[model samples]
Target: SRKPLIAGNWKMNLNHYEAIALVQKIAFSLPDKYYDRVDVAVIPPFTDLRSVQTLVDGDKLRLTYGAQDLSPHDSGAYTGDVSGAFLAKLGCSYVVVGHSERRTYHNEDDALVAAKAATALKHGLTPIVCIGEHLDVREAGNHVAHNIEQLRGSLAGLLAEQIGSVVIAYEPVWAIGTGRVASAADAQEVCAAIRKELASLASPRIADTVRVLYGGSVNAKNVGDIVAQDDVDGGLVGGASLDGEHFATLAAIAAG
Candidate 1:
């Protein structure tokens, strides 16, 4: 079965000290079995990974940690770039690729994002490949096709086995950080589309094994409804995840 995951994308937030404190509070608030039932992960900024790692290891916290992004190139003079190998060295279990911010600001096309995903897997790190449509595309009735094209391009050369190891997050660009969320049914529709794309690109078994998450202004209040949907396995939490109690509540909701 595909395990449910509740991951906090602490996007450019929290210093090392604050991250530790927040993580500690989260660990204390969550039930002991939270880790076993749901895979809890934190995608902290690069600067905070070491501190978070120390806390997770020292306290034996069940939560895992990852980086927000990684370089497509393995190493060498790629100034201002952190490679997947570097993140793996920091004990990250997962990495986020093709986040909307990266796509919008950095102009990261599908091929580049695909290379990054492959690189992360090569380093034994799970890459969360994010895909979605913008407001204009949705308004134009091209949301489904746009997202599907992204999936096809981003996953072009992956084998069935490799595809299974990747996590796909469907975050509508306009909804992200916009206090707008797709209804549970709406989210499931797109998630199902994503799964179908995976099945065609890889295999039915691989598609079934892959976990597709919803991300778009996700908060404690609405997380349960989304998680309850069959196609919505979990979430890529944003603002709500910064707070210990709120994030813990989100995780607990998923566990149920």
Candidate 2:
């Protein structure tokens, strides 16, 4: 059986030393036992990956590290774009795509996210494909419908193996940085809807195999209730994860 996974997304925060120190604290906080019970991951900015990687590898840390994004193209002439192969070579095990921020800031659409997911798959990286609805959509009572539509788009054309191998994070745009955490019931509703969508799109095997993570204003204090939900496999932690102690606490919660 698959154990719960706890991934910390550093986003744009953490410079080289900060990244290394945080990873070191995270490693020290969670001993070898915790790694076996719960899978731990850190998704830092491109600049801090190697620094984080060095610490992880040197200390033989079991924690996984990945990039926040990757280029859809394999090897292109595009400027300032990073290919999936590059990430793989850098020892990245996961890549985040279709995050609400990417969709909002870069104007990324579903097709683009799908292409990026494909690229991640090609290089043997797990794509944490994010799907969620904006505040307006949530207010209009269309969050489920909107999210399902986005989920279908981002995961379009993935084979059963590829589909089941990836991670799906449901991060409501409204709750991302608003400090407004959804209740455990609210998290379960959308995550269950996502599991249903996967079963509909692929098969029960794929649906059952894939991990659905909840990621919106997650913190140590409330992580326990969220993880207790049957449909919620783990968390894609944001701002709260920046603090090593709190992140380790969340990982500890996930482990137990």
Candidate 3:
């Protein structure tokens, strides 16, 4: 069975000190046996991973930690870039790739994102491969096709096992941070399409095992509805994740 995962993408927010405090609050709020039922991870900004890692280690918190992004190349003179090896040293279990912000601001096309995912695998980090359609594509009724194309490009050279290790987050660009979530049904449609693409590229077993997550304007109030969808295994929480109470509530919802 695909395990339920709720990852808090703290995104360019939260200083190291604040991240430590927030993580402590979240760790304390979690009920015992949280790890038994669901996997929880925090994808904080690069500067905060070490601090968060210290908390998880010091307290034996069930929470897993990861970087918000990583370099496509393993190492070398990639100025201002954090590599997957560096992330592994910090006890990172996952890394986010192809987030809308990266696509929009950094012009990271599918191929580059795919390379980054592969790099993460090389260093034992689970890459959360994000794929989605913009409003224009949705309006043109090509959302499914757009997402499938992204999946193909992102998984180009990955093996079936590697693909299964990766988590796919479907965050419609139009809905991200726009307060306009795709209805549970809409999210399911795209997630199902992503799984189908995976099945075609790899195998049915891998597709079934792959965890697909919904990540567009996700918050406590709407998370349950999205999680209720069969294709949506969990959520890649954005803004709502920064709030300890809100993220804890969403984690509880996923646990249920």
Badly placed stretches (over 4 Å) of model 1 are 177-181
- What's the lDDT for all of these models? 0.89, 0.88, 0.88
lDDT of 1 by residue, 1-256 (tens): 6778999999999999999999999999999877778889999999999999889899988999899999978999989999888888889999999999999999999998899899999999999999989887877888888999998888777777899899999987856556655788878989999999889888887899999999876787788899888888999999888999999999988988
Query: How many backbone clashes can be found in candidate 1?
Result: 0
Candidate 3 lDDT over 177-237, as tens digits, reads: 5665578899999999999988988899889999999988788788888888888999999
* Candidate 2 per-residue C-alpha lDDT over 152-225 given as tens digits, one digit per residue, 9 for 90 to 100: 99998787678887899999787656665578888899999999999988898779888999987788788999
Q: Top lDDT: which candidate number?
A: 1
TM-score of each: 0.97, 0.97, 0.97
TM-score of candidate 2 on Cα atoms, chains taken together: 0.97
- RMSD per model, one decimal: 1.2, 1.2, 1.2
Q: What is the lDDT of residue 199 in candidate 1?
A: 90
With a 3 Å backbone cut-off (N, CA, C), the pairs that clash in candidate 1 are none
Candidate 3 global lDDT? 0.88
Instruction: Name the lDDT of candidate 1.
Output: 0.89
